[PDB]
Design a protein around this ligand. Structure first.
Ligand SMILES: Cc1cn([C@H]2C[C@H](OP(=O)(O)O)[C@@H](COP(=O)(O)O)O2)c(=O)[nH]c1=O
Ligand SMILES: [Ca+2]
Length: 129
């Protein structure tokens, strides 16, 4: 797997972000996680967390897994990194996202993310409180 350049266009919610990728505006849906919608408990906190990581990042990168790269709504499916920190891992570790939507050719970071989620659970943090 490799990391590719991208730039922030704008933060959307806890697991969606608008980026410029190969010079094209594009909605990215984070692989392997689910954040609450904004209108649900921990949604605003998840939005705020993601926003902070991406807006304060000097460098954003996009990393596709080996399976499909666009979903049925035309969103990009990637892991997102902000100055080398994976956004999915930070959210899950904070208990603002669940490991979710784990499909077959697109699950390289599943174990890593489940570890993060185990700690958040043991802390009874946010979603797990
Ligand atoms: C994260 C992810 C979501 N999706 C689709 C499945 C879900 O479809 P349905 O909308 O039909 O339930 C939807 C959930 O995204 P959101 O959690 O952003 O709504 O996005 C994928 O197809 N692949 C993925 O890797
Ligand atoms: Ca969601």
């Amino acid at each position: 797997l490799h990391k590719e350049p991208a730039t922030l266009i704008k933060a959307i919610d806890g697991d969606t972000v608008k980026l410029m990728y190969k010079g094209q505006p594009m909605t990215f849906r984070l692989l392997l996680v689910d954040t609450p919608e904004f209108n649900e408990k921990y949604g605003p906190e998840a939005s705020a967390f993601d926003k902070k990581m991406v807006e304060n990042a000097k460098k954003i990168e996009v990393e596709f897994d080996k399976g499909q790269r666009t979903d049925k709504y035309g969103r990009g499916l990637a892991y997102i990194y902000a100055d080398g920190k994976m956004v999915e891992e930070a959210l899950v570790r904070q208990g603002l996202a669940k490991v979710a939507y784990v499909y077959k050719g697109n699950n390289t970071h599943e174990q890593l993310l489940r570890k993060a989620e185990a700690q958040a659970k043991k802390e009874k943090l946010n979603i797990w409180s």
